[PDB]
Design a protein around this ligand. Structure first.
Ligand SMILES: CCCCCCCCCCC(=O)OC[C@H](COP(=O)(O)OC[C@H](O)COP(=O)(O)OC[C@@H](COC(=O)CC)OC(=O)CCC)OC(=O)CCCCCCCC
Ligand code: HEM
Ligand code: HEM
Ligand SMILES: COc1c(O)c(C)c(C/C=C(/C)CC/C=C(\C)CC/C=C(/C)CC/C=C(/C)CC/C=C(\C)CCC=C(C)C)c(O)c1OC
Ligand SMILES: COc1c(O)c(C)c(C/C=C(\C)CC/C=C(\C)CC/C=C(/C)CC/C=C(/C)CC/C=C(\C)CCC=C(C)C)c(O)c1OC
Ligand SMILES: CCCCCCCCCCCCCCCCCC(=O)O[C@H](COC(=O)CCCCCC)COP(=O)(O)OCCN
Ligand SMILES: CCCCCCCCCCCCCCCCCC(=O)O[C@H](COC(=O)CCCCCC)COP(=O)(O)OCCN
Lengths: 55, 431, 126, 352, 352, 126, 55
């Protein structure tokens, strides 16, 4: 089989990101969960760079 | 081992073999299933069976004569076989019952009985012969809306509305001296066949067959015929290939021979020098496959067909096979080319030197109808031994690398992924 | 959720009653036309949620010919909805075709689950 | 050690070694089928992988076949490479390795596949039964291994020593220079094999008439008859077989198959009727036997049989049955019968 | 409608309904086996679950059995609860539901289990074959459903209407007051069944002698013989069966089984020889037949047979074969034969 | 790791040579006695690591009777070690029993993997 | 089956803590990995309670 399916760590990426079966009819209202994950990355990264200068 | 052609208004080809025990004589026409329309599709398959019906085969059996026929996309055949000292009787039967009189054959009783049997043949084919009906469906999605899409047996719906008038119309338009070749194989001399013909006069019709409005064109597409109750999945996949009378005719055949054919249950077939087999055998993703390179007058197809019981790992089978194809552009070795050279020679050396004169007649008549002449087997070998790695890489870079595909499948094909994930595997990204 | 046994008990009471049926049926018909599931080519029993054991049982007991047609109506409706179109008006489900084809299989599986459950918690006399 | 060859101007050659080692000489049920699957495995001097790879680069392939009288080892190749394939077939007959892991991994799973494929065909089942009730322990032995009798590795190794003996062999070539084949054969290792003896019996076999067997089976129904044939009556039954399938016959549409199997000490005529409805099978087979018991003239099918016989005898040493001249007439005597399928609705022997 | 009962001072009672609806009356192969598995399923008035739960609290169980002549519906219970079980068996014969999901979920998987269990026993295989070659389409019909002939739900429902008819029944009770059983039966629903007719033939059956059959099988080997018996010769063969298994015989150690099956129009004597080595099976069966063809005196086994017969006829209406007085002598005439297993090493009929 | 083909090539050279064998063999014998795997009831081929394809192949080709005994020696040794005892001295493996029972199956599987692998990367002449 | 095997979250606890197959002969040297997990909990908890008072 393919490496993306055999490796312990990439197997989880493949099953969640690459080969995951999705219904054919989902609309753009199903895209908000992706955005909330980018939001959490924006806040954690911007906050750690400010904490270097905060008292 | 040489063929001899003459012309009198009637073309006469012959491959004499003095060490054979039979002789075959027939007529080949240059019209097939790619010379009819969606309304009269199957009229040629019904012409074959009128030739092979009882009262015509009985009349031949009383004289010691056997009959045969074949329908293809570019040509049709009507052949008579006999013992070597009985060839003038073969020509007479072919004259009387076929070219001159046929009101005996197109009677009202013989036509209905023939139509009943042919409908049962086609209905049986569509319910039980799965590898062959998927390859016919491949032709119909690849060349859709074009003459090279129509099935050779006909379709059960178009075959029901045929009458005798459809047969007579098709005969007047295509069974013509300008569209015909008279053949002779086995223990038969060219001069004797020429002499026997001019003793008679032997002409069918004059000529002027119709020209075909549309040319064949390839289109990337897919057709899926899902049936969850069958125990396997049958799939075939191809790209556009080479026609007959192309400069890349033998290079495409060598490239198909590199990946070859496989049977999982035969021990010696598991030991072939094919690098794809190192990937499938560890989880056993298929039972068999075969690579083809089909060629017609206008276009061609290059690809593979497979059957498998492992319905949860179809995506691994298609993926690994298409990645091996990529190597023909990048990294094909010299050993893989020298192997395919000598196995291709053995392949077509067995096709052109079998012992059956019936197969000889079909091959000879089809080649002379296109090229006007037959290329000998000693000449074809020299073209194959002159191919290099550079010729293969140049051919593959033009015909395979990032090109559109056609796909057909039936059975348990839930695990066959969408078109664009398969199309993306035709290039690597890592070159 | 509510049982189809209870849904049928209330409905039958409304329907047998003349005054209530003349008052509640026209509201129910135009509730059906405003919903718009026929315009996608579906019958109502296609819409019932199937992720529960009583409903998994009813779908096994269904004949093969009715089951193949249900699968096609559901695939056709998903494709109609991702294109944001409706089907042609000559392919809409008509009223006489919108039949409860699956209700008898549901009521039979429900009545057996209640009989089994009462028998597992019985109070015995002496 | 008998050698023979015919030349031609072709490109492809063919070489064959024939051994009287088929099922009719088998010590146990299925030992000739297993031996058939051992050859072209590892040799004492080279492996099965290297043979496939070397011959592919030279342009050639190998194959082995089994029937009730012969095991045949065949090679197909390009004309110039003759001495390579002579030495390869010789080492197969001389020094095959016979290792236990080959039996477990390769040979037995392949024999299992052959059997499982064949037992889904009811016509092939009817054919083994007719061979089993007509003849008993020679021609009637089973063809394929099914496991009802246990066959070990030493049993296979003892059978090979029995049948691979210099006086039990035939070497034949198509499109081969006979003077050069004889030279390469005498200098090969199959000239060093042990001289044993031939196993062909010049007795005739013993047969039985008036037998019957029924078998239950899910699928299509079959009804078949069988007649033994001695050497003098052989041309008569060949004409009958081709007559009954040709368009000269009124009942050729009711029959599925008919043939005559030829051996050097007789033959067996067989006829088959197959259909899915079991009332069709019964109505047909009763018409076949009622009409054949009354008589048929066969002289109209002499020249049609001469054609067919020449066609199927093309690449073959041809037991010469060149006596179709004196054939006229056939009337059905006594025969055997088998039924397969829905046997509760198929006829019995003494109501035919 | 025939009723009968015997009282006792015991605690447990037993009630049985017997119907001439066994395999020898079957329209298609296996329709009586399937009907046997439909009864005690859901009724129009109560479910199969409630019947099991209600009767458990009263102390009783239900059972249904099939043989070649009878379908028997049986109940076992505590003495006082008679009218409950009379009404329960009546509703089974009257208004069984016959729903399609019961066939798919319950009946067919159970019939599949019965068949798969039986086809692993070679003695039971030999017994069906002797019934199939001796008799053909009555007593020789198959017992269990195997699927070679497709049986639908309407076929089952039409068979039930054929055999569940008031003139085809027998009601019998053990430890039951007969005057009260008659009262409860006349007021039950089995007094409302349609009056059809009895299916017993008072003709004798037609039989065949001198037949043979061989079957290949992995496991133990069997050799069996069978003789048909008419009503007048019935006491003679009963003595023979018990003689050949008793210690009065020299060859009782070579035999595995011997019995006589009794019907109201004759019987079938059967004998079996079983072993794992196939040379043992052949050496024994040849000694059995050579010794029985010469003659045996049976008068020493008259009183031993009277004991055994009284033992097995304990709870039974007993076809009265009370004529062991006049039995002396038996000499083997003609018979049938079957072989199962390694049939390449087992004897043939005309060498016994 | 190192191949058993290479281990055998070096060993055979040492053993065929008289001077080297008289100098390197006594060191090897007392290396065996100081290791102490016989005192737990094991032969040396029990110790070879088995998580690789050449070694998985060798264990399938092993006869059934030799394979059942190997499983018992391994279970007995695990139990001896969790108790922190040794086995009785009359249950220790003797020198004449410490045979290479698995080496021929290993050398056969190794030689086939090298032949296959040379054939997949061949340089052809013309 | 048991709830500890069917639940999405407890199935991971069961497979790692409760039903995990372990060799019979492992000794006390195999106990250090457990301790390193308690160590990390000690440091993270003690550190967060001090960070409330640190400048
Ligand atoms: C910093 C603090 C961290 C806390 C824990 C640290 C523990 C690390 C110690 C190293 C180690 O884990 O291996 C220890 C090893 C013995 O392991 P073993 O399984 O082979 O023997 C099981 C025993 O026989 C049965 O012991 P049993 O289970 O029967 O009784 C328990 C024993 C408690 O022992 C322990 O806690 C082990 C740490 O009870 C008593 O001792 C009673 C006296 C009060 O002993 C040796 O092999 C050599 C030990 C000396 C070298 C140690 C130097 C380390 C720097
Ligand atoms: C879910 C993630 C977070 C959310 C929703 C959040 C929210 C907020 C909000 C609403 C403020 C006040 C904004 C204002 O100045 O008006 C704030 C301030 C602040 N946050 Fe976060 N925060 C998040 C993560 C973090 C993290 C991980 C850190 C440190 C590593 C951090 C560090 C700070 C700091 C230093 C301030 C000081 C005021 C400023 O710079 O605006 N934040 N945060
Ligand atoms: C792997 C985990 C950690 C390690 C190994 C570690 C290590 C250390 C060390 C060596 C010191 C200096 C000790 C001294 O005073 O001499 C220290 C100080 C300190 N650490 Fe951590 N630390 C860890 C986690 C954390 C976390 C998560 C925090 C905050 C939430 C934290 C907060 C502090 C603070 C506030 C000090 C100040 C000096 C003191 O209070 O001793 N530590 N740490
Ligand atoms: C329907 O199916 C879906 C699906 O549709 C989608 C969109 C996703 C993808 C969507 C997600 C929400 C998953 C994405 C993951 C998260 C949101 C979790 C993020 C977790 C964190 C711990 C984020 C922290 C990020 C960091 C970069 C921390 C490190 C900080 C750094 C490097 C800055 C400080 C460094 C220095 C040197 C100053 C799915 O996983 C999925 O499942 C099948
Ligand atoms: C071999 O089998 C094993 C095994 O042997 C062992 C030992 C373990 C056990 C665990 C480990 C080896 C390590 C795993 C540990 C972690 C991932 C640690 C996470 C650490 C933390 C410290 C999380 C802390 C989170 C908090 C919210 C606490 C912090 C602060 C608080 C509560 C202050 C706030 C309070 C108030 C009142 C405001 C296994 O999991 C295991 O399975 C494989
Ligand atoms: C949910 C929270 C925690 C779980 C996170 C899962 C998702 C994380 C995505 C990780 C990205 C991919 C990481 C590397 C993938 C390749 C690993 C590999 O090749 O395995 C090893 C190399 O070993 C390593 O060095 C691992 C380094 C880990 C790097 C840490 C980030 C070799 O590959 P291996 O043979 O083991 O794969 C088996 C398939 N045949
Ligand atoms: C996140 C770190 C990465 C590693 C994964 C972490 C896994 C460790 C988790 C530790 C175990 C937590 C105990 C869960 C208790 C059982 C949950 C449950 O009852 O499931 C649900 C109810 O749960 C809830 O409503 C919310 C639970 C929130 C828990 C937040 C801690 C019961 O529902 P059900 O019976 O269907 O079981 C699920 C079947 N898949």
């Amino acid at each position: 089989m393919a490496f993306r399916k055999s490796n312990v760590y990439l197997s989880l990426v493949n099953s969640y990101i690459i080969d995951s079966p999705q219904p054919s009819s989902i609309n753009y209202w199903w895209n908000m969960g992706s955005l909330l994950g980018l939001c959490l990355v924006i806040q954690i990264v911007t906050g750690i760079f400010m904490a270097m200068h905060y008292s | 081992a040489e063929v001899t052609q003459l012309s009198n208004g009637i073309v006469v080809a012959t491959e004499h073999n003095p060490s054979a025990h039979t002789a075959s004589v027939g007529v080949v026409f240059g019209s097939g299933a790619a010379n009819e329309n969606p309304y009269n599709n199957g009229v040629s398959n019904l012409w074959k069976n009128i030739f092979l019906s009882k009262e015509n085969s009985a009349v031949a059996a009383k004289e010691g004569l056997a009959l045969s026929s074949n329908i293809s996309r570019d040509f049709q055949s009507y052949i008579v076989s006999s013992l070597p000292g009985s060839t003038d009787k073969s020509l007479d039967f072919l004259n009387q019952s076929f070219i001159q009189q046929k009101a005996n054959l197109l009677s009202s009783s013989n036509f209905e009985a023939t139509k009943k049997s042919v409908l049962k043949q086609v209905q049986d084919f569509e319910e039980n012969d799965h590898p062959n009906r998927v390859l016919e469906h491949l032709h119909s999605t690849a060349f859709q809306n074009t003459p090279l899409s129509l099935p050779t047996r006909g379709t059960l719906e178009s075959l029901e509305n045929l009458v005798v008038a459809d047969l007579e119309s098709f005969a007047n338009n295509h069974f013509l001296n300008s569209n015909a070749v008279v053949v002779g194989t086995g223990n038969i001399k060219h001069e004797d066949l020429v002499n026997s013909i001019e003793s008679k006069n032997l002409s069918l019709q004059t000529g002027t067959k119709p020209v075909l409005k549309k040319k064949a064109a390839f289109l990337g597409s897919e057709v899926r015929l899902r049936d969850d109750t069958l125990p396997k999945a049958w799939i075939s996949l191809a790209v556009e290939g080479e026609p007959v009378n192309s400069p890349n005719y033998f290079v495409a055949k060598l490239a198909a021979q590199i990946f070859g054919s496989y049977n999982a249950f035969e021990p010696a077939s598991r030991l072939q020098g094919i690098k794809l087999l190192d990937n499938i055998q560890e989880y056993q993703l298929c039972d068999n496959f075969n690579h083809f390179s089909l060629s017609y007058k206008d276009s061609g197809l290059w690809g593979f067909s497979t059957a498998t019981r492992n319905v949860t790992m179809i995506d691994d089978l298609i993926h690994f096979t298409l990645k091996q194809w990529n190597r023909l552009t990048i990294s094909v070795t010299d050993t893989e080319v020298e192997r395919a050279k000598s196995l291709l020679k053995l392949q077509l050396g067995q096709l052109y030197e079998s012992g059956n004169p019936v197969n000889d007649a079909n091959l000879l008549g089809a080649e002379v109808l296109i090229k006007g002449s037959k290329l000998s087997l000693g000449e074809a070998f020299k073209k194959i031994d002159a191919i290099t790695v550079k010729d293969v890489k140049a051919w593959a870079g033009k015909r395979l690398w990032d090109q559109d595909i056609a796909i057909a499948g039936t059975g348990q094909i839930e695990g066959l992924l969408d078109y664009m994930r398969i199309r993306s595997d035709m290039s690597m990204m890592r070159w | 959720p509510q049982s189809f046994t209870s849904i049928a008990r209330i409905g039958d009471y409304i329907l047998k009653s003349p005054v209530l049926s003349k008052l509640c049926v026209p509201v129910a018909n135009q509730f059906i036309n405003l919903a718009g599931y026929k315009k996608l080519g579906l019958k109502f029993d296609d819409l019932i949620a199937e992720e529960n054991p009583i409903m998994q049982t009813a779908l096994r007991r269904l004949p093969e010919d009715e089951s193949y047609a249900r699968a096609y109506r559901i695939i056709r409706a998903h494709q109609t909805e991702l294109t944001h179109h409706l089907l042609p008006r000559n392919e809409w489900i008509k009223a006489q075709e919108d039949v409860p084809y699956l209700l008898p299989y549901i009521l039979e599986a429900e009545a057996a689950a209640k009989e089994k459950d009462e028998l597992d918690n019985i109070e015995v006399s002496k | 050690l008998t050698v023979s060859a015919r030349d031609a101007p072709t490109k492809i050659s063919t070489l064959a070694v024939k051994v009287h080692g088929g099922s009719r000489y088998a010590t146990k049920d299925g030992v000739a089928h297993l031996l058939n699957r051992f050859n072209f495995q590892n040799t004492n001097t080279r492996s099965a992988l290297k043979l496939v790879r070397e011959s592919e680069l030279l342009g050639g392939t190998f194959k082995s076949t089994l029937d009730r009288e012969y095991i045949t080892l065949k090679a197909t190749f390009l004309k110039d490479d003759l001495p390579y394939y002579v030495n390869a077939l010789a080492d197969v007959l001389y020094k095959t390795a016979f290792k236990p892991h080959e039996l477990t991994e390769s040979v037995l799973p392949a024999a299992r596949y052959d059997y499982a494929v064949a037992e889904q065909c009811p016509v092939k089942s009817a054919e083994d039964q007719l061979y089993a009730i007509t003849f008993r322990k020679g021609l009637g032995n089973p063809l394929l291994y099914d496991g009802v009798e246990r066959v070990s590795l030493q049993d296979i190794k003892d059978f090979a020593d029995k049948v691979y003996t210099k006086e039990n062999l035939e070497v034949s070539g198509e499109n081969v220079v006979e003077a050069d084949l004889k030279r390469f054969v005498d200098e090969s290792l199959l000239s060093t094999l042990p001289a044993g003896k031939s196993l062909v019996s010049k007795s005739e076999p013993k047969f039985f008439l008036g037998e019957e067997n029924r078998v239950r089976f899910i699928g299509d129904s079959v009804a078949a008859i069988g007649i033994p044939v001695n050497k003098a009556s052989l041309a008569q039954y060949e004409v009958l077989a081709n007559y009954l399938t040709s368009a000269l016959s009124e009942l050729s549409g009711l029959i599925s198959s008919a043939k005559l199997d030829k051996f050097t000490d007789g033959g067996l005529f067989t006829l088959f009727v197959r259909d899915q409805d079991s009332a069709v099978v019964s109505s047909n087979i009763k018409k076949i036997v009622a009409d054949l018991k009354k008589g048929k003239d066969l002289s109209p099918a002499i020249n049609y049989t001469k054609l067919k016989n020449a066609v199927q005898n093309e690449s073959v040493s041809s037991p010469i049955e060149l006596n179709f001249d004196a054939v006229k007439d056939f009337k059905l005597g006594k025969f055997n019968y088998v039924a397969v399928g829905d046997v509760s609705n198929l006829p019995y022997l003494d109501e035919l």
